[PDB]
Amino acid sequence: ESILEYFRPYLGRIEIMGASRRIERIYFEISETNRAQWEMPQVKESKRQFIFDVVNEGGEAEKMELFVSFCEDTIFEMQIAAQISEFWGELEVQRVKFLNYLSRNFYTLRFLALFLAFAINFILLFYKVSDSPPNMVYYFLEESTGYMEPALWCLSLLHTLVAFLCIIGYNCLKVPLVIFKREKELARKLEFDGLYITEQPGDDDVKGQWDRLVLNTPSFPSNYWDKFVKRKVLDKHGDIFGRERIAELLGMDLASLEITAHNERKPDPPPGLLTWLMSIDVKYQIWKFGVIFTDNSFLYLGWYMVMSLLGHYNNFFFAAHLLDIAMGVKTLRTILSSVTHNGKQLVMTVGLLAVVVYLYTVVAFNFFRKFYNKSEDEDEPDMKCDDMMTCYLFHMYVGVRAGGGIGDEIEDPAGDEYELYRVVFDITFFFFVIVILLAIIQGLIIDAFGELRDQQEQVKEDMETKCFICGIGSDYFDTTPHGFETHTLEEHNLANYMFFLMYLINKDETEHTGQESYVWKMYQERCWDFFPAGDCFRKQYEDQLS
Amino acid sequence: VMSLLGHYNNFFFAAHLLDIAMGVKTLRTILSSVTHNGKQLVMTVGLLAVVVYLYTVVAFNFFRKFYNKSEDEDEPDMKCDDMMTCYLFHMYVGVRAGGGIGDEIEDPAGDEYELYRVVFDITFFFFVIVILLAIIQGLIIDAFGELRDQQEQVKEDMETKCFICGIGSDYFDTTPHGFETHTLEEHNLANYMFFLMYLINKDETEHTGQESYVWKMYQERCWDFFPAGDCFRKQYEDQLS
Ligand SMILES: Nc1ncnc2c1ncn2[C@@H]1O[C@H](COP(=O)(O)OP(=O)(O)OP(=O)(O)O)[C@@H](O)[C@H]1O
Ligand SMILES: Nc1ncnc2c1ncn2[C@@H]1O[C@H](COP(=O)(O)OP(=O)(O)OP(=O)(O)O)[C@@H](O)[C@H]1O
Ligand SMILES: Cn1c(=O)c2c(ncn2C)n(C)c1=O
Ligand SMILES: [Ca+2]
Ligand SMILES: [Ca+2]
Ligand SMILES: [Zn+2]
Ligand SMILES: [Zn+2]
């Protein structure tokens, strides 16, 4: 009992759909370092997000494929974590320590920048205007103590410094993950689909049209676990393209690859930085700069940097940094996610509002225009519907923002030939423009709240009543006491499958057992059959009570 | 403390009308839906403060000449001459106004910034008033709906699943009144509690084998005697129990 209790965290068990269509239980070793890297909070958040997006998108046939992609991405993620864990050579070692510190404390720098923005705007909250020096107007910071102006300048400089550190930390932390995903997806399209060979990417996929650059670059498979993907694609498409067009397209030399594969020698680089200076791959660096430039988060950080520089230009440009709380706190993320949900609906219904307001505008211009006086000075009439521009502007602004119909502001239609027509006009304007359309906007956002809550509840229910791996309903396991909990914690566990991946990658191919080699060969051939679907060990040997 | 301060001044007794919220259960449910999504409510009024501050800095830098807020021409009452008064004026008047802040601001007609002021007022009315206040209202309405969903779910779970074993209702309802009989006689919460009382009351020497077995797991805190996914009916279904 004591041995099992001690080795229980390191013992991992899974169930695979093995040979002869039989569910087989596989037992293996889980490294303590791998387990700790998995229990790190960032990996937990990534797993939660992956489960949420899988359940929300509803992928069923591709669920195992998305699980494989998540496992590969997160293994590369803790590879990054292990790298960032804890003269010219001294310059390089201090540089890598500095980037290490930034990558470790990226989130703390983000919170520090947000707090600095709060402090800067709190200082700006005492800005005062006086025409006289402290026609043309002076903007001066009024404060009795007088300490907040040097504080403002120092805080501006420190905020820009911390924001630059945020860009550097993002580049050292999240950029490699994005590059790894792009290289992996490009390799999948190149090999398992032939996206550029015996097929052509369409003009719609600008991502493919830009990924065309790294086809011929010698550093194509960098930042990616597979470095022989080019050779594999060459091997499977040489019979179709004569191997010479493949060599030209993917940028190898057949003789060079043969003479390096049979036997290779190792050169020595000089310690000077010049060899790196002309050994940088220009095309691959251009492609990487392009993809990380179109990456959304890096765009947000670049916008933050431009905003900070314009904050140095004028201090009030720092007020735009209070929108950072929306991306920072997750509660604003959910609330503004419900706001942005049905966003096409929102913008196109305010367009419908514009259209119906234009119809009311043309009606009011053709007749009822005498009521649009909008003037108290009798000698100087201020006709607001004397032309379509001013009438449409007046309607779309005043009548829309008014608490009721446009007749609230329009001169009262009493004792007129068009009295009933004006009454009908005002009632229809109030009932459609205000009562219906604004309530449509409000109902859209409220229903977006309800729909997002429904998504969260559905994800929780699916995770509670169905196993992620096999998909067997919970009641069959709950027939046995705590059966579903035991099944989802020991037999089929996402962490256990990931740790099997880590164990297979770590150990040598000569030490693989038959089951491990079988799983490894389907993992190399991208055939997700070993994942049990609709079958577990319990129903495999239910007659024998397992 | 409120009663003692009521002796100090009689008007401190007015705080005791909040006792009805804790007293009657209907106010408990209504104010429970109010307090539900309370972090949401307070942090969205914080978001309202942030966006109002953005509109405040925009209005301070330009459009500030329209914030006269004075009828006496000799004594201007500029409400956006500084960030304090501009932010206060926005966050109070413009938020509480029935529409945009342009309802109270001087009308932007015949000005170089006419279109800019129009866009400013439209955006203020559409985001500050139309969106955010409706977010608050939708939060409380969805809290009502979510609490009603909780009550309906509790009732449904109690109606279709036995509390003890968890077997679905349809298996018992195969027999007429089967679920009612099962939840009233075979597995009953009151019956299990009364077994607890009986075991505690009677002496340990008078315990039968089954009672000693249940008693020893109750002392060792092993809840295995509670049937889970199994009842007498499916235990002897072949023999018709
Ligand atoms: N094959 C499976 N592997 C793992 N979890 C599964 C599987 N099938 C279903 N589940 C469910 O996934 C849920 C995961 O939620 P849980 O909070 O336990 O995860 P966690 O990663 O330990 O959490 P956290 O990140 O909050 O520490 C479990 O409650 C379990 O019922
Ligand atoms: N094992 C169980 N023991 C008791 N009740 C169960 C069990 N399984 C399910 N139930 C359900 O619990 C419900 C309890 O509701 P009910 O109103 O009958 O209870 P009560 O305590 O008698 O009510 P009240 O407090 O209103 O007098 C029953 O309708 C029954 O269907
Ligand atoms: C499939 N696969 C991976 O997914 C992988 C890997 N090395 C790292 N990763 C992530 N190897 C060698 C591998 O064959
Ligand atoms: Ca072997
Ligand atoms: Ca006995
Ligand atoms: Zn399973
Ligand atoms: Zn039961």
Side-chain angles (χ1 to χ4, degrees), chain A residues 1-19 21-85 87-198 200-463 465-542 544-546, chain B residues 1-158 160-237 239-241:
Chain A
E1 172 70 5
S2 181
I3 314 171
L4 302 171
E5 287 283 357
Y6 170 82
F7 290 101
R8 185 165 307 179
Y10 316 96
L11 191 271
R13 67 278 301 293
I14 52 170
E15 298 176 1
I16 68 145
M17 165 47 88
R21 316 305 84 56
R22 284 170 39 183
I23 298 304
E24 298 162 0
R25 197 161 301 180
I26 300 190
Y27 312 88
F28 60 96
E29 177 169 1
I30 297 170
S31 167
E32 57 275 357
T33 65
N34 300 359
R35 202 178 203 66
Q37 292 150 359
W38 161 267
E39 307 293 355
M40 286 311 83
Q42 307 175 359
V43 174
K44 285 197 166 306
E45 179 181 0
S46 173
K47 169 201 185 179
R48 195 137 314 295
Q49 172 67 7
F50 144 82
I51 282 147
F52 175 85
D53 64 61
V54 158
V55 177
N56 202 3
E57 294 159 0
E60 178 183 300
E62 300 181 0
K63 175 172 56 62
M64 288 334 314
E65 160 67 3
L66 300 179
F67 174 76
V68 171
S69 300
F70 157 81
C71 294
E72 293 183 358
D73 184 293
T74 304
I75 292 195
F76 178 82
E77 165 190 1
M78 61 214 57
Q79 287 171 0
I80 294 186
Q83 300 164 0
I84 70 179
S85 178
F87 188 8
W88 261 335
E90 179 181 359
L91 167 137
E92 298 290 355
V93 74
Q94 299 288 355
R95 161 195 176 180
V96 302
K97 289 165 188 175
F98 171 81
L99 310 186
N100 211 335
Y101 163 84
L102 292 194
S103 54
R104 295 185 315 242
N105 299 0
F106 181 38
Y107 297 93
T108 83
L109 299 174
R110 287 301 298 174
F111 164 82
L112 180 61
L114 186 46
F115 160 82
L116 260 50
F118 270 98
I120 292 189
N121 291 174
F122 163 84
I123 299 181
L124 299 178
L125 266 169
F126 293 87
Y127 242 88
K128 191 170 183 177
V129 153
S130 172
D131 200 296
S132 63
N135 178 241
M136 61 66 58
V137 168
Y138 298 87
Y139 282 30
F140 78 99
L141 183 63
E142 174 52 62
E143 171 70 2
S144 61
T145 74
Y147 292 93
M148 321 205 298
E149 176 185 0
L152 190 49
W153 178 86
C154 166
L155 263 174
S156 168
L157 268 63
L158 182 56
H159 182 270
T160 302
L161 164 69
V162 175
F164 211 49
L165 301 181
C166 290
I167 292 190
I168 306 303
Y170 181 89
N171 199 2
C172 305
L173 187 49
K174 313 295 196 308
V175 164
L177 207 74
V178 178
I179 307 300
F180 170 84
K181 303 183 70 60
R182 294 276 298 238
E183 301 288 2
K184 160 180 57 180
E185 83 80 16
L186 194 51
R188 295 308 169 295
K189 299 187 311 181
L190 267 170
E191 163 170 57
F192 303 92
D193 310 300
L195 180 277
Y196 304 96
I197 299 156
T198 79
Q200 205 73 3
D203 53 1
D204 296 358
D205 44 70
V206 183
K207 51 167 302 178
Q209 300 289 352
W210 177 262
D211 288 0
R212 296 203 178 185
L213 300 189
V214 287
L215 303 183
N216 63 358
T217 65
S219 182
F220 170 47
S222 56
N223 205 63
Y224 173 38
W225 60 266
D226 189 3
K227 292 84 178 179
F228 298 90
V229 46
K230 299 207 291 185
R231 178 188 58 178
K232 304 163 61 183
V233 174
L234 168 80
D235 289 358
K236 51 183 306 181
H237 298 94
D239 306 358
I240 325 173
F241 273 30
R243 193 172 318 304
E244 180 54 60
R245 291 189 292 176
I246 308 288
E248 170 262 358
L249 195 134
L250 298 184
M252 52 205 98
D253 185 4
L254 304 181
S256 177
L257 67 93
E258 157 70 5
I259 68 185
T260 50
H262 92 275
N263 180 59
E264 54 192 1
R265 303 294 83 181
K266 309 305 298 178
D268 47 0
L273 267 57
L274 303 180
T275 180
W276 149 75
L277 282 166
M278 82 303 296
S279 73
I280 59 177
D281 189 2
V282 180
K283 200 165 188 177
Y284 178 83
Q285 294 288 355
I286 287 179
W287 175 89
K288 172 198 306 174
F289 278 26
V291 48
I292 83 182
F293 266 24
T294 41
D295 194 1
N296 289 357
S297 301
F298 179 86
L299 287 148
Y300 184 92
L301 294 186
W303 168 88
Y304 210 86
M305 231 45 49
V306 180
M307 282 323 314
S308 302
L309 294 175
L310 296 149
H312 287 272
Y313 191 93
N314 193 359
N315 307 354
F316 287 145
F317 283 94
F318 286 138
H321 297 145
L322 287 185
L323 300 177
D324 198 5
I325 68 184
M327 321 315 178
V329 315
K330 296 180 177 302
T331 314
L332 271 189
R333 269 291 188 180
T334 63
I335 295 166
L336 289 190
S337 177
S338 74
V339 172
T340 53
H341 200 90
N342 306 121
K344 178 182 180 60
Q345 314 283 353
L346 287 169
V347 301
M348 92 71 64
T349 312
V350 306
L352 179 62
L353 183 66
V355 172
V356 301
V357 160
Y358 185 42
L359 265 48
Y360 283 97
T361 293
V362 305
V363 169
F365 173 89
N366 303 359
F367 30 87
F368 312 147
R369 63 172 177 181
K370 52 180 175 178
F371 295 91
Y372 290 85
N373 183 239
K374 203 54 45 183
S375 174
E376 180 180 0
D377 302 0
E378 305 179 0
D379 54 0
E380 310 157 0
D382 295 358
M383 302 309 322
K384 247 61 180 179
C385 278
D386 216 0
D387 71 66
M388 223 65 40
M389 289 293 78
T390 178
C391 196
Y392 192 29
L393 176 56
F394 180 78
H395 275 91
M396 201 55 208
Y397 159 70
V398 160
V400 172
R401 296 189 314 122
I406 171 64
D408 303 358
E409 296 74 54
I410 305 318
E411 197 283 301
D412 176 59
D416 304 299
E417 309 87 1
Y418 296 92
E419 179 166 0
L420 300 183
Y421 304 94
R422 285 265 294 115
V423 165
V424 173
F425 176 87
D426 298 356
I427 294 307
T428 50
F429 195 94
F430 159 82
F431 176 80
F432 289 96
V433 171
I434 317 293
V435 167
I436 290 306
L437 293 192
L438 298 186
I440 287 170
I441 295 295
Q442 293 155 20
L444 284 175
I445 59 191
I446 297 181
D447 285 3
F449 279 99
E451 181 257 0
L452 288 184
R453 176 249 305 296
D454 191 3
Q455 296 180 357
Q456 315 285 353
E457 179 51 60
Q458 176 68 4
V459 174
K460 176 183 183 59
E461 175 264 356
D462 289 305
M463 282 316 268
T465 57
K466 310 166 191 61
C467 177
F468 192 92
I469 297 314
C470 60
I472 298 296
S474 71
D475 52 0
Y476 167 83
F477 307 115
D478 298 314
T479 307
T480 300
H482 306 90
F484 185 81
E485 165 69 5
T486 302
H487 176 88
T488 60
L489 185 66
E490 311 182 1
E491 299 190 0
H492 302 158
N493 194 1
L494 261 59
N496 291 359
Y497 282 93
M498 178 163 228
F499 291 148
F500 195 35
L501 219 36
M502 311 215 178
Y503 166 85
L504 280 192
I505 296 181
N506 195 4
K507 67 175 311 176
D508 303 358
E509 299 189 359
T510 171
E511 325 284 357
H512 285 149
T513 200
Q515 295 170 356
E516 296 163 2
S517 305
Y518 167 89
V519 178
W520 189 232
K521 70 180 185 59
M522 296 178 197
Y523 225 104
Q524 286 186 355
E525 300 289 355
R526 285 229 158 235
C527 190
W528 314 136
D529 196 296
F530 50 90
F531 284 140
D535 195 0
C536 64
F537 196 90
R538 305 178 51 176
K539 60 178 52 61
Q540 184 69 60
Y541 303 95
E542 45 193 0
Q544 321 179 2
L545 209 50
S546 299
Chain B
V1 180
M2 282 323 314
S3 302
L4 294 175
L5 296 149
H7 287 272
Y8 191 93
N9 193 359
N10 307 354
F11 287 145
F12 283 94
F13 286 138
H16 297 145
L17 287 185
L18 300 177
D19 198 5
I20 68 184
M22 321 315 178
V24 315
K25 296 180 177 302
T26 314
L27 271 189
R28 269 291 188 180
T29 63
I30 295 166
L31 289 190
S32 177
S33 74
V34 172
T35 53
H36 200 90
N37 306 121
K39 178 182 180 60
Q40 314 283 353
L41 287 169
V42 301
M43 92 71 64
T44 312
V45 306
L47 179 62
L48 183 66
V50 172
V51 301
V52 160
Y53 185 42
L54 265 48
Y55 283 97
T56 293
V57 305
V58 169
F60 173 89
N61 303 359
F62 30 87
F63 312 147
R64 63 172 177 181
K65 52 180 175 178
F66 295 91
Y67 290 85
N68 183 239
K69 203 54 45 183
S70 174
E71 180 180 0
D72 302 0
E73 305 179 0
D74 54 0
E75 310 157 0
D77 295 358
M78 302 309 322
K79 247 61 180 179
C80 278
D81 216 0
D82 71 66
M83 223 65 40
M84 289 293 78
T85 178
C86 196
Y87 192 29
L88 176 56
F89 180 78
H90 275 91
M91 201 55 208
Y92 159 70
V93 160
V95 172
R96 296 189 314 122
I101 171 64
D103 303 358
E104 296 74 54
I105 305 318
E106 197 283 301
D107 176 59
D111 304 299
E112 309 87 1
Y113 296 92
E114 179 166 0
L115 300 183
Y116 304 94
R117 285 265 294 115
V118 165
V119 173
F120 176 87
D121 298 356
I122 294 307
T123 50
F124 195 94
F125 159 82
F126 176 80
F127 289 96
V128 171
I129 317 293
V130 167
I131 290 306
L132 293 192
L133 298 186
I135 287 170
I136 295 295
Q137 293 155 20
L139 284 175
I140 59 191
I141 297 181
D142 285 3
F144 279 99
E146 181 257 0
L147 288 184
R148 176 249 305 296
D149 191 3
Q150 296 180 357
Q151 315 285 353
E152 179 51 60
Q153 176 68 4
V154 174
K155 176 183 183 59
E156 175 264 356
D157 289 305
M158 282 316 268
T160 57
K161 310 166 191 61
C162 177
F163 192 92
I164 297 314
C165 60
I167 298 296
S169 71
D170 52 0
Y171 167 83
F172 307 115
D173 298 314
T174 307
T175 300
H177 306 90
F179 185 81
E180 165 69 5
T181 302
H182 176 88
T183 60
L184 185 66
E185 311 182 1
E186 299 190 0
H187 302 158
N188 194 1
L189 261 59
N191 291 359
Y192 282 93
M193 178 163 228
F194 291 148
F195 195 35
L196 219 36
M197 311 215 178
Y198 166 85
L199 280 192
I200 296 181
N201 195 4
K202 67 175 311 176
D203 303 358
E204 299 189 359
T205 171
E206 325 284 357
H207 285 149
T208 200
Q210 295 170 356
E211 296 163 2
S212 305
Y213 167 89
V214 178
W215 189 232
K216 70 180 185 59
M217 296 178 197
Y218 225 104
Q219 286 186 355
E220 300 289 355
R221 285 229 158 235
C222 190
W223 314 136
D224 196 296
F225 50 90
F226 284 140
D230 195 0
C231 64
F232 196 90
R233 305 178 51 176
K234 60 178 52 61
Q235 184 69 60
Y236 303 95
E237 45 193 0
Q239 321 179 2
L240 209 50
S241 299

